[PDB]
């Protein structure tokens, strides 16, 4: 019963972690394939010689070069390295939209699609929900795996609520004012988890937690208006389940993305110490408070885009791309990122359609970017 | 459609609640059966008018005839109403370890046993699961219905240890000099629940954690060493489950006992508005922190009574009804409650035998009745 995993950016944050959950056990896990982009190298090489795998996809050329005998390059090599490979689970931890083509080559191959790569879910819509078998994608964010584990305590038809936790970011309690000199350096620092740029970002907007409320709606089916978040910052309630009769039932532990990791790979067996339990012979304190949405409309936008449907989900998602890069290079401030997702979602109506192809994912995508990167230049 | 309940204890804390809950789901649910004891009459008229039904045990003969109609009365009325009613479901909500005889019966007439008494299994022991079959025991006490729900969470193996709350009572983080001081109106009143006065003074002095830790072992047969207490002042979360791969799963509402009356009158369906659901919308905290075992040994004894296990756990709640009622009636101090269970636990060694017949549990029962009540007189 030794799965065979394939793992997208095993270079990253959730990669090295996912590597060294199989690493610990070789019983359950071996690693037959990995991807990333070529912009660490040397992690990359480490991980060759570690695991002993060759099968290997590298994005960028110049860095496929100096690595030197790597299978697959370019943009296309984590798509064509799933599809020419034979594995039981693949993990998705690429970042960004771009993660699609490998999340829908996963689906086909009938795999389980263990999914990091929230993007590719919230661009993908119905696209990769009808891609899909039943329990064929696994959640490996931190949410949706505790919604997965709180919904076995009833029937779908129980469910009256769900609930996200969010940390509320380092700018916790900020006022609209305050975020107005937000640095990138600022904003490069999360309470309670360390992540590649991306999902650090994110999550001081709250555009993770948008996204996240997005990716909630597509894997459990739940409308919008039944999905709610409360700001948690110790991050140990990664979610919760309110049910019919007043019972809601909840996932905590220490954060540590290596238990989501596990679970999803060995789903729906657990994996004996994945992670670290709450300790309960020490005192301890779990603060919730409501999110200000009045200074932070990330996941106000978000259900905007959700209910809308079709391809406004890229659309949020794609502008957040652009306008997050942006605020990086410094050419924005952090209260235009949120800003510009607004701006970008109210003019894209014509993006309300359910996409038939990939194709209108990526059109409304390259809309979507093209419309932040006027913003931005203005 | 509807579930015929018989509900033994009526006219008290959970009784009452019970048939509330019934008269708020007549679809769902019908009384077809009520017993007491005869200390409140008019509460009994009260229930017999209101639900219709003159099935009705008083045990106070006396009583009985006051209140008229009443077709058993005596000792043994609670048992024989139990085994002349046909009925889906009895509802055990009487008090104290009398409660046996019934709780032995209705698992013999094949119904389903919701038990809130539960003192009466704490005495029963194997005694009791002998009696019951896979799953007819259903728990209404709160932590065990929490633990239900939270064990839904994982298979059998995958279980690492059951975590109770306690409230900690209104003497919670007290010294034990603090103790010493402690009158019968200041151990009357609790922090989160209102109920009668057994386990009102129970959870003061921790012996209903106690006897709640014996409880999880008996219905859901995990060890004792697997088996935690946590105290928690809010009592909002009622008990949790921690996994082997570091996960905890907790079930959570404000204190209401309709909730877990609710849940076990209709398991495994939930029964809609039974309670109402945690509010995120305002700000709130829920805290942990140990229970001080020098000062609040019981939790200890309990376990310790449980791994000697036989009659022990007869002998640690009876020990603790007599200590406990001399208390009320100001003849001893409120440490000496615990001072004198621990006592009558150490001298009980000959007790650490399996009972053969409900006899043996009621003999343990009076030694260590008497044994108390020895200790009580000096
Ligand atoms: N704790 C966390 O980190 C959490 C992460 N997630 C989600 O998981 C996903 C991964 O996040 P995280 O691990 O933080 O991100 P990182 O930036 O740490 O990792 C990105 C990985 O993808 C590779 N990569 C980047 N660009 C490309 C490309 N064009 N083609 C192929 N590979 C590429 C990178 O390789 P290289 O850098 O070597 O080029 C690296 O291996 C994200 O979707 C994120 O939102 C969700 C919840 C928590
Ligand atoms: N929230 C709560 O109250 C909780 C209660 N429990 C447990 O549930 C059980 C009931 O508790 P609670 O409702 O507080 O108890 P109460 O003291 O409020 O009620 C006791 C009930 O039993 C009846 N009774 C007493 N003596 C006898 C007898 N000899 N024969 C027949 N009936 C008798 C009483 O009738 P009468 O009117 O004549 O006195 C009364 O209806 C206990 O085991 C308790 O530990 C557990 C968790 C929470
Ligand atoms: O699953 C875990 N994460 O998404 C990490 C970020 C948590 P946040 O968005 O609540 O700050
Ligand atoms: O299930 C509810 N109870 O047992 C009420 C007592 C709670 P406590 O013993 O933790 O104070
Ligand atoms: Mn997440
Ligand atoms: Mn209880």
């Not at 070069?65 to 993990?91: C, K, N």
């Not at 555009?207 to 700001?231: A, C, M, S």
């Not at 039932?249 to 790979?265: C, E, G, N, R, V």
């Amino acid at each position: 019963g030794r799965l065979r995993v394939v793992v997208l950016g095993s270079t990253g944050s959730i990669g090295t972690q996912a590597l060294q959950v199989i690493a610990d056990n070789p019983d359950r896990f071996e690693v037959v394939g990995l991807a990333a982009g070529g912009a660490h190298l040397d992690t990359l090489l480490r991980q060759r010689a570690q695991t002993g795998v060759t099968n290997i996809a590298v994005a960028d050329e110049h860095a496929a070069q100096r690595v030197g005998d790597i299978p697959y390059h370019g943009s296309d090599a984590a798509t064509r390295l799933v599809e020419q490979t034979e594995a039981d689970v693949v993990l998705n931890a690429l970042v960004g939209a771009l993660g699609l083509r490998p999340t829908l080559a996963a689906l086909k191959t009938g795999a389980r699609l263990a999914l990091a790569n929230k993007e590719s879910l919230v661009a993908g819509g119905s696209l990769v929900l009808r891609a899909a078998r039943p329990g064929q994608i696994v959640p490996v964010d931190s949410e949706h795996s505790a919604l997965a584990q709180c919904l076995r305590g009833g029937t779908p038809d129980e469910v009256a609520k769900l609930v996200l936790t969010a940390s509320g970011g380092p700018f916790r309690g900020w006022s609209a004012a305050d975020l107005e000199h937000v640095t990138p350096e600022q904003a490069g620092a999360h309470p309670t988890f360390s992540m590649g740029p991306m999902n650090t970002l994110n999550s001081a907007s709250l555009v993770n937690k948008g996204l996240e409320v997005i990716e909630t709606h597509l894997l459990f089916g739940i409308p919008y208006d039944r999905i709610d978040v409360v700001v948690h910052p110790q991050s140990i309630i990664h979610s919760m389940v309110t049910f019919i009769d007043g019972s809601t039932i909840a996932q905590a532990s220490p954060p540590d993305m290596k238990l989501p990791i596990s679970l999803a790979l060995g789903w729906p067996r657990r994996v004996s110490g994945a992670a670290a339990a709450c300790d309960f012979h020490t005192a301890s304190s779990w603060e919730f408070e409501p999110l200000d949405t009045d200074v932070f409309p990330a996941v106000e936008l978000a259900r905007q885009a959700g209910v809308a449907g079709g391809c406004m989900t890229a659309v949020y998602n794609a502008a957040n791309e652009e306008a997050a890069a942006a605020f990086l290079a410094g050419r924005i401030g952090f209260p235009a990122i949120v800003g510009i997702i607004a701006d970008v979602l109210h003019a894209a109506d014509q993006w309300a359609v359910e996409p038939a192809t990939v194709d209108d994912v990526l059109d409304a995508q390259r809309w979507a970017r093209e419309r932040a990167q006027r913003a931005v230049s203005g």
